[PDB]
Design a protein around this ligand. Structure first.
Ligand code: BAK
Ligand code: CA
Ligand code: MG
Ligand code: ZN
Ligand code: ZN
Length: 223
């Protein structure tokens, strides 16, 4: 997250850290047995860590569970990153409490103007590399599709939306990947891509989760 702040320990209780020996992507808990992340975060052998804040220290409120299965969206295009979403089932169900809770899926799509919260343990420098150990947060509004498509001509589809600041300075970044974008209590986006991080006129591009609720719901009920 570049230009964001420290959330506070367990203040974003639906945030997850995907680990394959190290933290490589984030995810959101949707219920005791399922997580949603990005498809470009697909790897084999993933452990889902919940109640995390500092990912390098065991502070006591964590739950480390391995995944039993990963389902990448059937229409995911790794080249355009269109339909960049993946579901992860846990081997055991997480025990939900104040530090580990699930986030709700949207009933409709959010409007441009809406402020959301984006969180993750990804890079924090635009020019440089700094990886934090605690969760970083960023409040950012949904941008008009017009400004999104001008910045990325011919790259944006109806399953993507941009959020951020065109001036630059503030954006999600590598490592935040798969992470949540919550607007008004609903998970509206997943960190998908952008051009570098926090660059002027290069806002982040997020998977428009409101277009996948039927797919998510149908898949977790049948798996
Ligand atoms: N396991 C891998 N091979 C992997 C995993 C995540 C990655 N993430 C990037 C990346 O390159 C990347 N993830 C981004 C997320 C947000 C923004 C943004 N500017 N908003 C830019 C990003 N760039 N490469 C990745 C490679
Ligand atoms: Ca920890
Ligand atoms: Mg994240
Ligand atoms: Zn990424
Ligand atoms: Zn990149």
């Amino acid at each position: 997250i570049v230009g964001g702040y420290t959330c506070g320990a367990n203040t974003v209780p639906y945030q997850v850290s995907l680990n394959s020996g190290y933290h490589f992507c984030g995810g959101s808990l949707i219920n005791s047995q399922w997580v949603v992340s990005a498809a470009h975060c697909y790897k084999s052998g993933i452990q889902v860590r919940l109640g995390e804040d500092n990912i390098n220290v065991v502070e006591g409120n964590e739950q480390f569970i391995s995944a039993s299965k990963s389902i990448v969206h059937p229409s995911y295009n790794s080249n355009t990153l269109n339909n960049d979403i993946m579901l992860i089932k846990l081997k055991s169900a997480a025990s939900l409490n104040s530090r580990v809770a699930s986030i709700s899926l949207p009933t409709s799509c959010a409007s441009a103007g809406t402020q959301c919260l984006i969180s993750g343990w990804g890079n924090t420098k635009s020019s440089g590399t700094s990886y934090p150990d605690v969760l970083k947060c960023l409040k950012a509004p949904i941008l008009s599709d017009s400004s999104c498509k001008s910045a990325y001509p011919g790259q944006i589809t109806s399953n993507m939306f941009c959020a951020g600041y065109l001036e630059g300075g503030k954006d999600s970044c590598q490592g935040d990947s798969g992470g949540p974008v919550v607007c008004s209590g609903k998970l509206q986006g997943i960190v998908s891509w952008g051009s570098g991080c926090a660059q002027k006129n290069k806002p982040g591009v997020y998977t428009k989760v409101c277009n996948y609720v039927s797919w998510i719901k149908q898949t977790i009920a049948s798996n």
